[PDB]
């Protein structure tokens, strides 16, 4: 089998946002948002 | 919806108040005491545009809008000011440009060759974003921002010559810019000429001779490229050298007018009879912008002092003041008249004449577009990610929304509300208070959605004047420069329609040395005060810019106001750094259609991947915000709840027969005009498959009980009428534009005044 | 500086609970930093707005009217006081294990709330069950009536 | 075609010389404004290089060993029950790394190359971080 | 039916419990509400997955194993078996409450993990500054060595 | 004597942000470790 | 939740290591931070992953085992979980400049390596040279006889 | 990092092993050089293949199907065990030692023989750095007075 391992470890160039934010919302679920009722 | 009582201004509605902006907490404000006689006939409003996204990273320098990223990295990044953050630019400028190794050091690293020539074949190629990992070694900063600058100058003199790979590409998001100056804004900009000045001195280098030389002869050793970089770096730095402090230029010539305009000047000091007469006071003197501009400087600093020699050198101050802000700019002087074009005004009359509401509105062209995006992480831990826009999910909306467009039109709701004060109001004169002043401004509300804030502390920052401390600085920082927005726009309305206005000058709790407000002559002829006012001589002289509104006359807004969306489809491939969870909302939704055939309830469940067309349900794609869609909705829906709230409880009290009937004639009317709208979006793109589903999971729950089939002469229309009702909610209800509690009151009202029982009543023969 | 508005009132409050006990005095002098002497803290409070708002943390018996009127007086120490002034809040070693049993039943809460609308509704709906039975009836009588 | 093998070969030889000599060459200098022209020079390479195997992954039987690569990946995630693949293959990295890998099999299922002398010509684009820095990919349709 | 894989293994455990003591037998039967006769509840075990489940929750000691497995065989019973089975979390009279005073501490952490990034990192972070200074010291003398 | 140690503040300062940040952050670092349990927690329960 | 494949293993695991003593039980629950009582505890357990590993480190003895198959079915939490369970490593003063005596030294190697080829090669190249001289007859006579 | 899969095998194999017998310290202490205590041996197997690889050869017992399991689990240690474990096999009396034992030897010695050159050539290489130090020295004198 090829070895890809060494191609592997990287980094990314770094940069800095200008506005700080949005971090922790990376990985998320909002499960859905009912409807109202109807009559 | 912002509804306040003109008869007490203070208290109702203290942030459009003058009482508040130049520095009077207390309920005193002077009357028509003493006076000057003056015409605005200029102003400075910022160019019709809001943010788009633009991308630093490739080889080219574009001088105006570098220093809008400063504006927004300094300003509304949290720091102190743009001012003392371009100071710290020079001051990083010198360190390099100034600095012979730094120029050497990183021309042996992108042409490889430290001690010897390099021929015209073996060229290699080096990525952008190499030379800026080394450059932040050799020139350490804190502030990002600087080496993204340097980093594509070099890229701009070596571009010709191809020493670097073009494919990197990067993007950030500009920010939107307030239409009026507040005082440091006039600082900002000065200081930006500043800047604009140093920029378009790298950004001019061509290099043409360093790639003949190159060309011709073969080779050239590094010697020649770290001269001629070092030579063009302290070109700029020549430029920066030796401007005046924005701080004290404006802090000045913000005074010198003050003292010019205002009557009470001490003889003392009175700016002196050459400054009067220098080029281009006339000019300043006239401006507007500046005028509310000074009234803040009073309101904060308290006070003003002229540094500058009284004569010789603040008449070479003027002179490059003029010229700052003059020049193309975010700022471009335009005659009063056209930067409040697009407010516009409505009123209810009495009989005699005065006002009972009168209302003002901000007109809008609905935005009809809408986007998606799918976002992409780089690596594990990584923010830079890079979001993919997907086309046929948006292609769906874009042609679902663009049917709603047409039929929401602002205009249309004033014309609606008084045809309400029409009919809900007693024969008789309104002395018992003030005419309440209802205003309508989609922009404030708009503003809290893509700020994510609530509403309330919105509206209640106008009441009472001061800003929630409990919510985190970057709002109050964008709240505060709205509500001066707000404040602003208000004095140029006023100014426009009454060209009349007289400076005063405030002095009666000595607050500060020097103040002054307009008054305003507006001739009214009308018996009664609005507000409170002698209204003596057949025209009022009020301070408030706000009563002197209420006098005019219908107004109709010949301009629309342009909202535009943020544009994600072009650039593709660039990474994202700016956060955009902040615009996005998540996208997801579930309803349930329930009706009741023949004494059993049957409901069919739905979800809006099938209602696209998507065949499974994916998780990540999130909606860009409608702000302004949501804003307008938002409006037309308090409005609706608001008129038909108030027709119910005159409908109660009326006590008349004529007048009862005028009533009903006006709910059902409103009601099954409601509706015959909503109706209206349910024929559209996800209206159609939204009710093609739901009666499609109310069959198949039958097939089990053999019962009767309906006639559908007015059946297939009655059962039809109703479900597209349904689409009209659910389509409304999983875009953002409908909240779900306000779903359920408008199904409320709607149910109510059984619309449906009269919408089919024009189905029918008898 | 102190904006005299603030002075009128707060001035006195502070004086008073000085008079009352000298063991607060050393307090202040302590978290403030400034000189022991009750003329000196007094001194130091008209100056700036942020030591005063400090002092009155110290003193909230008599003094917690003042400190409020203070808020609407200057933005700018409130918001540079809520830091100044802070006290990390004992945990219980319990709670955060006490807190885990709750997950399996909030998410059964959430699935009743979004079926039936906000939770304000939900809070209702659960009385109107829990409700007498007769209400029922009465309801239904009115209606008899042709009341509705 | 052993005149191909030849000189993919020798080029092999030579270059992975190279490297051995500059790291060599910079650890002696000992001296700031060299070791910037070195290490301007490794990485100068590493490009240079990074885009030949890149290129010669276009190629189509460069293409065909992408688009299988993907495609059995996608195939064998559905079946998992998560989609997310198809916004995540093609990104800053992965869509390098699979694109290289295609680039070195192609010389491999040839003769023009030995398999242990392709893993380590990885390792040479590993520390270089020729990869990383450079975030862009031309496709040759 | 019961898949046997599971009932392989489900069967005997819960005959094993039932042979070691009699006080669980009436329990289940009261339960799953079957015929107190050990033969009887044995023969709807194999009927049902749902019933064997609610069986298997009535004895944990022995039958944990089981269980497992038969939640991995049946994922549909999963879902309505979590259901049927429930007990009710008792809650702190204190917690709620006490609960309150973090939310001035809480929004305190979330303002310095966006900063750092992901709350992992700024957990490590933490350890890097609280770690011990000669680190800092081994860490600059192997770059001294000129390794990285 | 404490010319020394004000530039050392001044320059945690700059890389913080304002004055401001850095009294909070470092509460947030002194700040006692369940905390950072209880906050991970509410993320596992799927509160943001 | 915790994927039954370990909780069938790990829950047993748990429960037998409480069995053996009670001053675990009391140490878990000051670490996870979970209600002292032992039946608490193996309810947060089944609610969390990472609840679940904390306690595997706590019990290294019996609980080692599926400690390790907890982390092959959730590389999710093999991060987390690294960094929520920590010790500063004790170092020795003598260390850091214990190491600066080898710098002479392994630069020493390193240009014997590259001369050589990989270091695997070298350790293999010394074993040659150190080996006895016989096998250099030996091998001299096996290309005698005409063997290669 | 150890893969799991290989973890749960080693770990109870060392360990049982240490347990066994407490002589077994004087192997891990011998070539990997793994600290004193039983406890950090532990934490170096845990770290490092190549570690754990030594580990498992060196005690015997209980160990080889462990040893061969890591082998294919993790097969870049193949090159790195089977060569830093390494015992001459002295001499055979008789002509026929053969490749019976020798096998791995004779294998050996052609690497070190194919680097350097002709087999002939390693033998002298051989001697070379077995000379006295003190014949560098002369054959550089004479070099010095200019003689070669």
């Known amino acids: 089998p090829t070895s890809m391992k060494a191609l592997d470890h990287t980094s990314i160039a770094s940069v800095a946002p200008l506005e700080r934010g949005s971090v922790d919302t990376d990985d998320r679920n909002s499960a859905p948002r009912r409807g109202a009722n109807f009559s | 919806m912002f509804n306040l009582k003109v008869k007490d201004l203070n208290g109702s509605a203290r942030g459009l108040t003058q009482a508040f902006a130049i520095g009077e907490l207390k309920n005193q404000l002077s009357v028509g005491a003493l006076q000057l006689p003056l015409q605005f006939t200029r102003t400075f409003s910022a160019s019709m545009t809001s943010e788009l996204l633009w991308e630093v990273g490739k080889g080219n320098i574009d001088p105006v809008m570098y220093a809008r990223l400063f504006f927004q990295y300094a300003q509304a990044g949290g720091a102190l000011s743009v001012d003392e953050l371009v100071n710290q630019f020079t001051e990083y400028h010198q360190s390099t440009a100034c600095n012979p190794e730094i120029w050497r050091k990183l021309t042996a690293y992108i042409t490889g060759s430290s001690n010897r020539a390099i021929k015209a074949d073996a060229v290699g190629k080096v990525p952008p974003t190499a030379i800026l990992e080394?450059?932040?070694?050799?020139?350490?900063?804190?502030?990002?921002?600087?080496?993204?600058?340097?980093?594509?100058?070099?890229?701009?003199?070596?571009?010709?010559?191809?020493?670097?790979?073009?494919?990197?590409?990067?993007?950030?998001?500009?920010?939107?810019?307030?239409?009026?100056?507040?005082?440091?804004?006039?600082?900002?900009?000065?200081?930006?000429?500043?800047?604009?000045?140093?920029?378009?001195?790298?950004?001019?280098?061509?290099?043409?001779?360093?790639?003949?030389?190159?060309?011709?002869?073969?080779?050239?050793?590094?010697?020649?490229?770290?001269?001629?970089?070092?030579?063009?770096?302290?070109?700029?730095?020549?430029?920066?050298?030796?401007?005046?402090?924005?701080?004290?230029?404006?802090?000045?010539?913000?005074?010198?007018?003050?003292?010019?305009?205002?009557?009470?000047?001490?003889?003392?000091?009175?700016?002196?009879?050459?400054?009067?007469?220098?080029?281009?006071?006339?000019?300043?003197?006239?401006?507007?912008?500046?005028?509310?501009?000074?009234?803040?400087?009073?309101?904060?600093?308290?006070?003003?002092?002229?540094?500058?020699?009284?004569?010789?050198?603040?008449?070479?101050?003027?002179?490059?003041?003029?010229?700052?802000?003059?020049?193309?700019?975010?700022?471009?002087?335009?005659?009063?008249?056209?930067?409040?074009?697009?407010?516009?005004?409505?009123?209810?009359?009495?009989?005699?004449?005065?006002?009972?509401?009168?209302?003002?509105?901000?007109?809008?062209?609905?935005?009809?577009?809408?986007?998606?995006?799918?976002?992409?992480?780089?690596?594990?831990?990584?923010?830079?990610?890079?979001?993919?826009?997907?086309?046929?999910?948006?292609?769906?909306?874009?042609?679902?929304?663009?049917?709603?467009?047409?039929?929401?039109?602002?205009?249309?709701?004033?014309?609606?509300?008084?045809?309400?004060?029409?009919?809900?109001?007693?024969?008789?004169?309104?002395?018992?208070?003030?005419?309440?002043?209802?205003?309508?401004?989609?922009?404030?509300?708009?503003?809290?959605?893509?700020?994510?804030?609530?509403?309330?502390?919105?509206?209640?920052?106008?009441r009472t004047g001061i800003v929630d401390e409990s919510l985190e600085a970057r709002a109050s920082n964008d709240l505060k420069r709205s509500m001066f927005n707000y404040y602003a726009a208000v004095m140029h309305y006023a100014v426009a329609h009454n060209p009349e206005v007289v400076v005063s000058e405030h002095q009666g709790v000595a607050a500060e040395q020097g103040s002054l407000y307009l008054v305003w002559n507006v001739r009214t002829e009308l018996r009664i005060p609005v507000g409170y006012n002698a209204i003596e001589g057949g025209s009022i002289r009020t301070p408030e810019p706000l009563e002197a509104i209420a006098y005019n006359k219908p107004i109709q807004p010949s301009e629309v106001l342009q909202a535009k969306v943020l544009d994600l489809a072009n650039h593709t491939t660039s990474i994202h750094i700016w956060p955009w969870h902040e615009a996005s909302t998540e996208f997801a939704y579930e309803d349930a259609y329930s009706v009741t055939i023949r004494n059993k309830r049957y409901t069919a469940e739905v979800k809006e991947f099938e209602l696209l067309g998507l065949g499974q349900r994916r998780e990540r794609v999130r909606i860009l915000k409608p702000t302004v869609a949501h804003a307008i909705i938002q409006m037309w829906y308090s409005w609706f709840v608001e008129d038909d709230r108030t027709l119910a409880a005159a409908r109660r009290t009326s006590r008349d027969d004529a007048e009862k009937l005028a009533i009903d004639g006006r709910r059902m009317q409103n009601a099954v005009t409601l509706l015959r709208k909503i109706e209206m979006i349910g024929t559209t793109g996800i209206g159609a498959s939204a009710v093609h589903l739901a009666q499609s999971r109310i069959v198949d729950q039958m097939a089990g009980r053999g019962l009767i089939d309906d006639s559908s002469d007015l059946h297939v229309g009655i059962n039809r009428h109703r479900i597209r009702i349904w689409a009209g909610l659910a389509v409304l209800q999983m875009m953002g534009l409908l909240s779900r509690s306000e779903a359920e009151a408008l199904t409320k009202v709607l149910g109510d005044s059984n619309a449906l029982g009269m919408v089919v009543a024009t189905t029918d023969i008898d | 500086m102190l904006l005299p508005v603030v002075a009128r009132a707060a001035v006195p409050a502070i004086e008073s609970a000085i008079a009352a006990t000298p063991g607060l005095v050393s307090r202040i002098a302590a978290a403030i930093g400034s000189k022991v002497s009750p003329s000196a803290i007094l001194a130091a409070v008209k100056s700036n707005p942020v030591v005063a708002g400090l002092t009155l943390a110290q003193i909230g018996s008599t003094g917690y009217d003042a400190y409020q009127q203070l808020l609407e007086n200057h933005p700018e120490v409130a918001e540079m006081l809520k830091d100044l002034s802070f006290k990390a809040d004992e945990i219980q070693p319990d709670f955060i294990g006490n807190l885990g049993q709750y997950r399996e039943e909030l998410e059964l809460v959430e699935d009743a709330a979004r079926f039936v609308g906000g939770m304000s509704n939900l809070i209702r709906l659960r009385q109107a069950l829990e409700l007498d039975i007769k209400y029922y009836g009465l309801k239904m009588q009115l209606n008899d009536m042709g009341y509705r």
């Open chain 2, 134 to 462: 080394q450059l932040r070694t050799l020139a350490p900063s804190e502030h990002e921002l600087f080496h993204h600058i340097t980093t594509d100058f070099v890229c701009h003199v070596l571009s010709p010559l191809g020493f670097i790979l073009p494919d990197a590409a990067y993007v950030y998001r500009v920010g939107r810019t307030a239409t009026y100056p507040n005082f440091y804004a006039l600082v900002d900009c000065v200081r930006a000429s500043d800047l604009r000045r140093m920029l378009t001195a790298l950004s001019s280098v061509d290099s043409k001779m360093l790639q003949a030389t190159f060309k011709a002869k073969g080779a050239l050793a590094p010697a020649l490229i770290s001269q001629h970089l070092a030579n063009a770096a302290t070109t700029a730095f020549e430029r920066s050298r030796g401007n005046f402090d924005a701080n004290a230029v404006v802090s000045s010539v913000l005074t010198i007018l003050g003292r010019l305009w205002s009557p009470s000047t001490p003889k003392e000091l009175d700016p002196s009879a050459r400054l009067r007469n220098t080029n281009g006071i006339d000019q300043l003197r006239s401006n507007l912008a500046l005028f509310i501009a000074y009234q803040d400087m009073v309101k904060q600093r308290g006070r003003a002092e002229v540094i500058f020699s009284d004569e010789e050198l603040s008449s070479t101050i003027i002179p490059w003041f003029i010229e700052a802000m003059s020049e193309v700019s975010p700022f471009k002087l335009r005659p009063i008249n056209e930067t409040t074009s697009y407010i516009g005004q409505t009123s209810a009359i009495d009989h005699m004449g005065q006002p009972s509401h009168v209302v003002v509105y901000e007109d809008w062209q609905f935005a009809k577009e809408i986007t998606a995006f799918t976002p992409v992480k780089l690596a594990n831990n990584s923010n830079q990610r890079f979001l993919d826009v997907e086309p046929g999910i948006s292609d769906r909306m874009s042609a679902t929304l663009a049917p709603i467009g047409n039929t929401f039109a602002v205009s249309a709701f004033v014309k609606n509300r008084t045809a309400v004060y029409e009919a809900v109001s007693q024969r008789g004169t309104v002395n018992s208070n003030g005419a309440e002043m209802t205003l309508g401004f989609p922009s404030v509300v708009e503003r809290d959605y893509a700020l994510d804030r609530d509403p309330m502390v919105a509206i209640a920052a106008l």
